[PDB]
């Protein structure tokens, strides 16, 4: 059913499926910083899962396959979302409308500053490229379907192709030339490698703060990466 959709139907479906921007609880410490983020991320997860079911092609997968993809992609998806809504706030990360942080607050947790700077770098990259919302929702869907696909596929790959068609469709609409179209496509997809990298370093520290003392849902998302 996803393959039969047009490019605009794909875009509208993805935009309509967008999760809400949540608020955090109302100077920081290491424990309080991690508390606000853990709470926020845990509530975001619930919405992400409902967003995922609305990604065209995702419902066609087995429960086990759906579970696999979410377990692999969830931090990437949280991160690209964070990076996206941080665009209009250069030098800052908009975790929530009432939780806007700079890299200086990032040091409150021993090792957040490394990933903080990477996240800021990504946001600045998106701002430099003038990333559009229609492009953003395509990239986020790509992350969901691609990140786990080699750790189990043809259905998934054809859906991925359809999103590529959609991305190109959006760029042609914006008035980009043929050369500018594939160049921008490549640029956007290469950033996904960085998002994977940030997620990998991110997972690495969550395992190191479970040890020693996260919700049971977060713990189960984590155990899948160890």
């Amino acid at each position: 059913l996803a393959l039969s959709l047009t490019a605009d139907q794909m875009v509208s479906a993805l935009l309509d499926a967008e999760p809400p921007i949540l608020y955090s609880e109302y100077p920081f410490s290491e424990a309080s910083m991690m508390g606000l983020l853990t709470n926020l991320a845990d509530r975001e997860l619930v919405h992400m899962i409902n967003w995922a079911k609305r990604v065209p092609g995702f419902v066609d997968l087995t429960l086990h396959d759906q579970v696999h993809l979410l377990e692999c992609a969830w931090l990437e998806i949280l991160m690209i979302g964070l990076v996206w809504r941080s665009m209009e706030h250069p030098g800052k990360l908009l975790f929530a409308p009432n939780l806007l942080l700079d890299r200086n607050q990032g040091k409150c947790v021993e090792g957040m500053v490394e990933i903080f700077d990477m996240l800021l770098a990504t946001s600045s990259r998106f701002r430099m490229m003038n990333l559009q919302g229609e492009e953003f929702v395509c990239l986020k869907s790509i992350i969901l379907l691609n990140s786990g696909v080699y750790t189990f596929k043809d259905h998934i790959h054809r859906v991925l192709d359809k999103i590529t068609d959609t991305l190109i469709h959006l760029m042609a609409k914006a008035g980009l030339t043929l050369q500018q179209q594939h160049q921008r496509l490549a640029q956007l997809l290469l950033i996904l490698s960085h998002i994977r990298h940030m997620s990998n370093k991110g997972m690495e520290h969550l395992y190191s703060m479970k040890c020693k003392n996260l919700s049971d849902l977060l713990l189960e998302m984590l155990d899948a990466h160890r």
Binding site: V46, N50, L63, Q66, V67, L217
Partner: peptide, 10 residues
Amino acid sequence: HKILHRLLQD
């Protein structure tokens, strides 16, 4: 046994 299972089915 898996919370993610429940949230997806619901």
